[PDB]
Amino acid sequence: MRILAIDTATEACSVALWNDGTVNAHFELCPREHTQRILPMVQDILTTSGTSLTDINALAYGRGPGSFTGVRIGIGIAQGLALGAELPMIGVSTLMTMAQGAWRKNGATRVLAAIDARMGEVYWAEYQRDENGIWHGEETEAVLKPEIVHERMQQLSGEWVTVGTGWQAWPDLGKESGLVLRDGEVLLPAAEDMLPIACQMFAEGKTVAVEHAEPVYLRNNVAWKKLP
Amino acid sequence: MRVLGIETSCDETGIAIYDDEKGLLANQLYSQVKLHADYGGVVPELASRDHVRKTVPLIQAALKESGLTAKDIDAVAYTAGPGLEGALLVGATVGRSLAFAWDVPAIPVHHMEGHLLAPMLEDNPPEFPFVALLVSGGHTQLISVTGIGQYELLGESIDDAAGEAFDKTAKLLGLDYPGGPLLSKMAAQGTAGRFVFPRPMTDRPGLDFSFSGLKTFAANTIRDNGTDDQTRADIARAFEDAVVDTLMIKCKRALDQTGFKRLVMAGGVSANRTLRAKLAEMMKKRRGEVFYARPEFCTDNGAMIAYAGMVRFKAGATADLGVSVRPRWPLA
Numbered sequence: 001m002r003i004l005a006i007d008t009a010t011e012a013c014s015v016a017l018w019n020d021g022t023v024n025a026h027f028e029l030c031p032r033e034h035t036q037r038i039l040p041m042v043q044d045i046l047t048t049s050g051t052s053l054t055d056i057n058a059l060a061y062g063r064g065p066g067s068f069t070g071v072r073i074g075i076g077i078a079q080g081l082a083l084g085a086e087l088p089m090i091g092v093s094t095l096m097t098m099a100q101g102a103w104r105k106n107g108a109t110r111v112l113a114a115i116d117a118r119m120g121e122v123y124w125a126e127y128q129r130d131e132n133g134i135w136h137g138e139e140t141e142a143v144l145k146p147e148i149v150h151e152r153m154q155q156l157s158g159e160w161v162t163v164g165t166g167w168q169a170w171p172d173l174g175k176e177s178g179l180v181l182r183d184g185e186v187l188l189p190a191a192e193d194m195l196p197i198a199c200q201m202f203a204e205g206k207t208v209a210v211e212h213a214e215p216v217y218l219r220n221n222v223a224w225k226k227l228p
Numbered sequence: 229m230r231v232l233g234i235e236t237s238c239d240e241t242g243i244a245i246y247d248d249e250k251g252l253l254a255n256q257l258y259s260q261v262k263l264h265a266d267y268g269g270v271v272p273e274l275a276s277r278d279h280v281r282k283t284v285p286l287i288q289a290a291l292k293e294s295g296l297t298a299k300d301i302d303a304v305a306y307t308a309g310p311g312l313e314g315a316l317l318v319g320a321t322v323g324r325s326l327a328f329a330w331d332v333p334a335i336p337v338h339h340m341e342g343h344l345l346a347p348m349l350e351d352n353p354p355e356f357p358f359v360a361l362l363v364s365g366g367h368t369q370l371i372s373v374t375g376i377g378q379y380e381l382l383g384e385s386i387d388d389a390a391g392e393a394f395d396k397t398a399k400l401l402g403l404d405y406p407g408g409p410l411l412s413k414m415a416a417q418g419t420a421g422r423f424v425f426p427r428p429m430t431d432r433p434g435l436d437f438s439f440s441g442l443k444t445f446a447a448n449t450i451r452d453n454g455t456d457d458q459t460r461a462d463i464a465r466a467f468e469d470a471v472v473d474t475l476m477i478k479c480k481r482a483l484d485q486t487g488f489k490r491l492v493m494a495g496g497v498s499a500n501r502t503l504r505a506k507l508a509e510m511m512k513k514r515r516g517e518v519f520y521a522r523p524e525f526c527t528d529n530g531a532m533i534a535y536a537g538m539v540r541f542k543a544g545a546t547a548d549l550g551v552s553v554r555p556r557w558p559l560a
């Protein structure tokens with residue numbers, strides 16, 4: 001099984017390749033350069049691992065949330081590749097990706113992901129890894145004001161790890177929460193961390209044809225007022 | 229050869245395939261008018277989102293419509309600008325990664341060059357050189373065209389484009405956005421001469437345009453006259469007749485100045501029936517020739533991008549792996 005993953009949902013661009021076990025991965029900050037670096041990085045990862053696009057079994061993309069523009073770059077690039085090489089696609093949550101990264105880095109199994117969404121809000125999720133390595137919490141994904149995050153945290157218990165730029169923009173987000181909070185050491189999603197999630201989704205038959213690939217935006221109220 | 233063209237500059241998603249032996253093999257279009265009507269304008273974020281939903285499926289329908297497969301396409305063209313950054317990025321990212329996966333050349337196309345070349349999709353297209361009147365939603369320009377990629381700016385609007393002037397006056401008349409075509413359907417019922425509007429920038433030499441004062445002139449007339457159906461029509465006709473005579477006069481001056489005998493008209497306003505008749509008449513009396521596209525190719529479409537990508541490819545304009553769009557991107 002070969003899986004190719006790409007992510008441009010945040011200030012990072014990353015690509016990663018899974019070859020039946022061995023991982024090859026690149027990651028970099030690309031503020032204002034996503035569209036310039038992404039396809040060169042795909043090319044390089046394919047050539048350095050001596051694999052061609054036609055030998056990939058599935059294409060995993062960062063489906064959101066994040067920068068609207070970044071999320072669309074990601075899905076657009078993934079769709080072009082998948083349409084062109086007739087690849088099935090696997091959409092991976094940006095918040096879940098960062099949780100997988102905290103697991104990889106320090107074995108965290110309870111992750112509070114917060115992404116700065118702008119507009120004084122964050123993209124929020126509560127992910128918990130089960131004994132079989134499955135992440136639970138997809139249903140908790142939401143865009144929320146910091147005061148609402150505060151109230152939600154007071155309904156949680158115990159010990160959690162923090163990941164995402166939302167904690168960086170609001171370092172007191174977890175103040176008076178009642179939880180023990182530790183830094184998860186993950187600011188941004190990495191395509192490397194999509195691969196294990198994408199691997200499990202592929203095993204479950206949970207892939208889609210290119211025309212069904214969907215972005216997840218979370219903030220949907222994005223229009224100026226309608227006319228009378 | 230065959231080129232797949234992708235247009236996502238604003239609020240239309242267009243996909244087409246153009247074959248330089250057999251012509252246009254596929255044309256697919258999704259207009260977002262319903263979505264933006266509610267807002268009285270295009271919401272960039274909503275336009276961007278809808279392109280994501282339409283682009284891939286319209287590409288698939290195009291290949292289905294043409295009975296072609298991936299190996300039959302020699303290049304992928306996509307609009308790189310001008311237009312809305314967020315919309316442009318959808319077409320350009322799909323288009324550029326698609327070309328990478330098919331391993332064929334990727335062609336960034338200038339949206340206005342797309343409009344300019346649309347009349348080349350009809351029988352007996354224009355030879356160089358010619359004057360071109362680009363009259364669209366956000367552009368109004370006169371251009372001396374002496375060859376491929378050889379564009380010289382003769383004149384342009386210093387304020388509103390003619391398309392927007394139609395839209396603004398149409399809204400004042402209480403019509404749905406964009407009302408250009410609707411205003412035009414209303415004008416047909418009006419009696420010529422009932423009101424007479426100014427022909428802006430015609431009492432001095434020069435090839436530039438202005439439409440802002442004409443808008444106010446019509447707005448003042450609407451305010452100080454009856455809102456009955458016949459009076460509304462008389463105003464729409466005076467306005468359209470003013471715009472059409474202005475463009476005609478400027479085209480005349482541009483033909484006089486260049487000495488060319490061919491007039492090419494492009495962009496959405498060139499679907500206007502009064503304007504087509506007026507410019508055809510003028511070119512008849514000059515013993516010259518007018519060229520324009522079928523109405524559905526005057527406004528946005530992918531056909532014009534597949535053609536213009538074909539032309540840009542033959543002229544050597546290909547993209548590296550980096551993708552860039554240019555929201556503002558001067559033609560000439």
Ligand SMILES: Nc1ncnc2c1ncn2[C@@H]1O[C@H](COP(=O)(O)OP(=O)(O)OP(=O)(O)O)[C@@H](O)[C@H]1O
Pocket residue numbers: 238310311339343363364365366367390391392394395406407408409412495496497498499500501526527528
């Ligand atoms: N029959 C008509 N009479 C007058 N104006 C018309 C007619 N048909 C279309 N238009 C105008 O053409 C404009 C849109 O044409 P077009 O699609 O070329 O603009 P566009 O895609 O926005 O290009 P640009 O980016 O330069 O604005 C609108 O303002 C519309 O009302």
Ligand SMILES: [Fe+3]
Pocket residue numbers: 339343364365527528
């Ligand atoms: Fe246009």
Ligand SMILES: [Mg+2]
Pocket residue numbers: 238239240528
């Ligand atoms: Mg348009």
